[PDB]
Amino acid sequence: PSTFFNLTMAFSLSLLGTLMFRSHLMSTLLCLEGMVLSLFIMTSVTSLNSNSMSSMPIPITILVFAACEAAVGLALLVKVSNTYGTDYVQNLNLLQC
C-alpha cells in the first residue's frame, strides 16, 4: 500500500532521472540499475504478499536480464569511452549528418 506508493514514487523519480542526461551515460546506467532495483523490490513484495512461491524466480530472471543488460551497457561504454576519451553524451553529436 504505502510502501508500494513510495516504491512507485521512487520508480517515477528513477524514470525522471533516466529520461534526462546531466554528466555521463554511466550515471544513466546507474539510474537504470536503481530503477530495476526498485522494480525487483516491487516484484518481491508482490510475490511475497500474495504467498505465491511459483512466481518467486521471476525476480531471479528479472535480475538476470537486469545485470546482463547492464553488462552489455558497460561493454558498450568501454567501447565508446576508449573511442572518445571521455564518455560524455554531449560529445555524441555526429549522428545528425
Partner 1 sequence: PFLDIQKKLGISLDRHFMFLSAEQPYKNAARCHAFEKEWIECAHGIGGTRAKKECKIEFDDFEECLLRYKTMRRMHDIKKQREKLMKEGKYTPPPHHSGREEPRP
Partner 2 sequence: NLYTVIFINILLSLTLILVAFWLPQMNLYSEKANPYECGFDPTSSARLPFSMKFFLVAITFLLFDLEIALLLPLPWAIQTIKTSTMMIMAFILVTILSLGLAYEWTQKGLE
Partner 3 sequence: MNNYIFVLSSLFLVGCLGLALKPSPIYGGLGLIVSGFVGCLMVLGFGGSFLGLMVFLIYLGGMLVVFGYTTAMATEEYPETWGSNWLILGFLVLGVIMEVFLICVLNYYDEVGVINLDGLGDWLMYEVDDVGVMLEGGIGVAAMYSCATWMMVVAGWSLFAGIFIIIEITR
Interface residues with partner 3 (CB under 8 A) are: 1-3, 5-7, 9-10, 13-14, 16-17, 20, 22-31, 33-34, 37-38, 40-41, 44-45, 47-54, 56-61, 63-65, 67-68, 70-72, 74-79, 81-82, 86-87
Distance in angstroms (rounded) separating the CA atoms of residues 79 and 67: 18
The three-class DSSP label of residue 73 is helix
Residue of 50, 82, 83, 90 interacting with partner 1 (CB under 8 A) = 50
* Partner that binds at residue 20, options partner 3, partner 1, partner 2, none, CB closer than 5 to 8 Å by kind: partner 3
Distance in angstroms (rounded) separating the CA atoms of residues 78 and 85: 10
Do the beta carbons of residue 59 and residue 47 sit within 8 Å? yes
